[PDB]
Design a protein around this ligand. Structure first.
Ligand SMILES: Cc1cc2nc3c(=O)[nH]c(=O)nc-3n(C[C@H](O)[C@H](O)[C@H](O)COP(=O)(O)OP(=O)(O)OC[C@H]3O[C@@H](n4cnc5c(N)ncnc54)[C@H](O)[C@@H]3O)c2cc1C
Ligand code: SF4
Ligand code: SF4
Lengths: 105, 456
């Protein structure tokens, strides 16, 4: 009795992920939220190309967002939690079949 | 004898090869290491794509003299010094070369550089000296939208770039290209005006909002005493320019029919820095049989960076060079109304590392020609007088705030070699760069209009 609006949704993607902004706009919005080239080159790109995420190296030695000089987005202040001794983390690669991302409305 | 492009760095379209090589690194070290803070990853990426105009634009935005700097910048000391690829077998990217190339194509295009719409328009602003510092300051100011005039003592423009740095390293057409781009801005240059009897800061005060003192270090160092060119002696100040005039076509209307200076027999060049090495190389250009570069100090502490010393070395110039202390020239002997030799004393470094000259040990070096490379400094008293009231430091140079580059007088700013604090084209252009924002803040205040802080 459940409507899986999946196929219905894939359909329209194959029918054309649409774009509607002219590079003159794109850049200014982007600018609003301080986006950058590092942002498009370092990070966005590999996601599209490889279907995967920018791996990098060495520490993070930028200031902490509140102490930053430059505009930094909310998400920078929200740090992700992880579990240490109380519980173990999972292998999302080797054990992907147990995880899941199903969403219901 | 002749001035071909000796630069190793120069690149043909083949620059494409290195452009691809560049890692195009994030928060690149090279840019941080660049005085003007050029966005090297982006301009390089651009050349990789082959869109030379894009890289050229990126280069020019940060430095007005992108061409000259690409050719001249002591990169190892500068941006290339922190190039990450240096860790690799291939070695660091020759950023200077790619900058030259991208710039060169742009020159070929013949595009003119337009003005941004408008700003506090411009009470008269004056800049003294046509060199890198003033040109940079003037162009940024014009970008702001001001009316400005640069008063140049000499008939030629470009400063040391034109006068001294050799054609083989720095083609004259290069400096001409940049000045023209600046000119498109509407900056006006007038050639036979000098900050001295003719022009003074108080004279300028007669109607003039602000002034930038760009004149550099006009004179050279002392020991030669009245010695004449006919006899033998030439200061770098004298020598380089004569070679420049004969060698570079646009520089002067008159053809130096006298031709290149006739330098024959052994030439002794005294100096550790860029000046000495350029004179050594230029000397062979004028027919010198042999050139000796004498250093007071030790070989290890040669002032010029390795790339330039390399040019002299390949050239086969001999470096008599030892001990941190001065092979120091005691005296020049002239017989026959011509210099036969120069007398030196050996010097050596003590634990104190303070230099010692040992009188007992002397060297008589035979030489037909001596060129003194030691350096330059301001000493012309009327020039200094021109400068009043502005405060001078105990280095006898105009004091300026490092950030603002403002002089004791709020209206007057200074930058470049005159500041005595940097001795590179890119730092001089940077000086003008930084000054321009501050002159702008000052003038706008006069306008009663604010400037943010961020500057842009
Ligand atoms: C031989 C030599 C080789 C060099 N090689 C290099 C190199 O390879 N790479 C590099 O980065 N740097 C090099 N430099 C340094 C570089 O040339 C200088 O740092 C730079 O040109 C300084 O710019 P500037 O505008 O301050 O002064 P310049 O000294 O460049 O400009 C001063 C201008 O003021 C004019 N002037 C002088 N007195 C007056 C007055 N009283 N009134 C009006 N106008 C006046 C002069 O005629 C001149 O046009 C070299 C310098 C020398 C001497
Ligand atoms: S972006 Fe700069 S010149 Fe290129 S590899 Fe050398 S450090 Fe990265
Ligand atoms: S202007 Fe900056 S220091 Fe000279 S990136 Fe170019 S050659 Fe290097």
């Amino acid at each position: 009795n459940t409507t899986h609006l999946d196929e219905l949704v894939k359909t329209a993607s194959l029918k054309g992920e649409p774009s509607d902004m002219d590079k003159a706009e794109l850049r200014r919005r982007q600018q609003a939220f301080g986006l950058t080239m590092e942002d498009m080159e370092l990070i966005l790109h590999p996601m599209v190309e490889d279907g995967k995420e920018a791996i990098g190296s060495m520490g993070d030695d930028s200031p902490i967002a509140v102490l930053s000089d430059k505009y930094r987005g909310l998400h920078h202040f929200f740090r992700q939690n992880f579990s240490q001794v109380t519980n173990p983390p999972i292998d999302s690669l080797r054990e992907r079949r147990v995880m899941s991302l199903k969403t219901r409305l | 004898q002749d001035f071909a492009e000796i630069y190793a760095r120069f690149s043909d379209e083949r620059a494409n090869e290195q452009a691809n090589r560049c890692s195009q690194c994030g928060v690149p070290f090279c840019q941080v290491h660049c005085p003007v803070s050029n966005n090297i990853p982006d301009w390089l990426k651009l050349t990789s794509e082959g869109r030379l105009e894009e890289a050229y634009e990126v280069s020019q935005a940060t430095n007005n003299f992108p061409e000259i700097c690409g050719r001249i910048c002591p990169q190892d000391r500068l941006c290339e010094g922190n190039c990450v690829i240096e860790q690799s077998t291939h070695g660091a990217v020759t950023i200077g070369s790619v900058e030259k190339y991208i710039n060169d194509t742009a020159w070929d295009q013949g595009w003119v550089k337009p003005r941004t719409p408008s700003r506090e328009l411009g009470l008269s602003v004056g800049v003294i000296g046509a060199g890198p510092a003033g040109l940079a300051a003037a162009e940024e100011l014009r970008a702001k939208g001001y009316e400005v005039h640069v008063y140049d003592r000499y008939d030629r423009m470009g400063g040391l770039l034109v006068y001294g740095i050799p054609g083989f390293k720095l083609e004259k057409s290069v400096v001409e290209r940049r000045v023209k781009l600046l000119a498109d801005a509407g900056v006006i240059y007038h050639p036979n005006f000098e900050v001295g009897r003719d022009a003074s800061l108080p004279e300028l005060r007669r109607k003039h909002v602000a002034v930038l003192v760009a004149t550099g270090v006009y004179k050279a160092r002392d020991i030669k005493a009245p010695g004449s060119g006919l006899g033998n002696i030439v200061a770098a100040l004298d020598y380089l320019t004569t070679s420049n005039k004969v060698s570079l076509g646009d520089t002067v209307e008159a053809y130096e029919n006298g031709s290149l200076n006739a330098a024959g027999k052994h030439v002794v060049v005294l100096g550790g820095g860029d000046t000495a090495m350029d004179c050594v190389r230029t000397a062979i250009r004028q027919g010198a049989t042999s050139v000796k570069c004498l250093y007071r100090r030790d070989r290890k502490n040669m002032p010029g960076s390795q790339r330039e010393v390399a040019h002299a070395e390949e050239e086969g110039v001999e470096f008599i060079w030892q001990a941190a202390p001065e092979g120091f020239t005691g005296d020049t002997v002239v017989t026959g109304v011509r210099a036969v030799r120069i007398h030196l004393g050996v010097a050596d470094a003590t634990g104190r590392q303070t230099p010692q000259v040992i009188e007992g040990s002397e060297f008589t070096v035979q030489a037909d020609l001596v060129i003194k490379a030691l350096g330059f400094e301001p000493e012309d008293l009327p020039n200094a007088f021109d400068e009043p009231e502005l405060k001078v430091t105990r280095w006898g140079t105009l004091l300026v705030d490092h950030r603002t580059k403002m002089t004791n007088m709020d209206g007057v700013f200074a930058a470049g070699d005159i500041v005595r604090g940097a001795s590179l084209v890119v730092w001089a252009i940077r000086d003008g760069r930084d000054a321009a924002e501050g002159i702008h803040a000052y003038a706008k205040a006069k306008a009663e209009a604010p400037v943010a802080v961020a500057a842009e």
